């Protein structure tokens, strides 16, 4: 790829610069290049990868929702194909980004990740990007896309429960996202609420073990679980 000639360390340095410049497409390209060097990623590097693609796909998803809403209102209205065409364009670009991320996870980040922190991180990302594919899916394969998200989240949950404390921020963000998966993808709002509550309560009971800085990190994510519970109940 286009980043094959750049040093791994230079790609990581430039990913950090792109983050500071809010140039997230560049950031994602640099981190894709770094992954393709073939070496495992550090905790910091995994976060750079996640931040870059989160922001890229987040813009695409927000645009897709705007266009989908316009398209829906047009199908209630004065009549052409332009709205559908442009929604499809954004959708296809979004699917391409999701496919690229899933391809990095499959070649070969997940299979080389042996530590719980790295393996859970990548399986959570796999669930997230199948979930984003599920958000726009409508055809023969929607159920398989949903089950791919579920399966990745479930394996991440199983490992995280066995190997990480209940306040671990990756464990908490995994549970947050699997809860949202249940609520709005799988049509299982009770499972979503149950998971958010049990996750919150088990984290609260472990806070006493933490330093001041870890306490801040954990309670930040616990508040997101609380926000969703307040929205859903």
């Amino acid at each position: 790829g286009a980043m094959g000639s750049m040093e791994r360390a230079s790609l990581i340095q430039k990913a950090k610069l792109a983050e500071q410049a809010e140039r997230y497409e560049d950031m994602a390209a640099f981190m894709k290049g770094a992954v393709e060097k073939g070496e495992e990623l550090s905790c910091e590097e995994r976060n750079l990868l996640s931040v870059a693609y989160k922001n890229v796909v987040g813009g695409q998803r927000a645009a897709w929702r705007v266009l989908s809403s316009i398209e829906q209102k047009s199908n209630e209205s004065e009549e052409g194909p332009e709205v559908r065409e442009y929604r499809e364009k954004v959708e296809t670009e979004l699917q391409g980004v999701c496919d690229t991320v899933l391809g990095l996870l499959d070649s070969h980040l997940i299979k080389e990740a042996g530590d719980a922190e790295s393996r859970v991180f990548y399986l959570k990302m796999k669930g997230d990007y199948y979930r984003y594919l599920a958000e726009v899916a409508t055809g023969d394969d929607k159920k398989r896309i949903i089950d791919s998200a579920r399966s990745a989240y479930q394996e991440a949950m199983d490992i995280s429960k066995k190997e990480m404390p209940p306040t671990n921020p990756i464990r908490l963000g995994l549970a947050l996202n699997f809860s949202v998966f249940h609520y709005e993808i799988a049509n299982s709002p009770e499972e979503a609420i149950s998971l958010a509550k049990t996750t919150f309560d088990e984290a609260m009971a472990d806070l006493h073990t933490l330093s001041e800085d870890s306490y801040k990190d954990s309670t930040l994510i616990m508040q997101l679980l609380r926000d969703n519970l307040t929205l859903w109940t």
């Binding site: 947050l176 949202v180 709005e184 997101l224 926000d227 969703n228 929205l231």
Partner: peptide
Amino acid sequence: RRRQT
């Protein structure tokens, strides 16, 4: 509000 992830 939009749910959080």
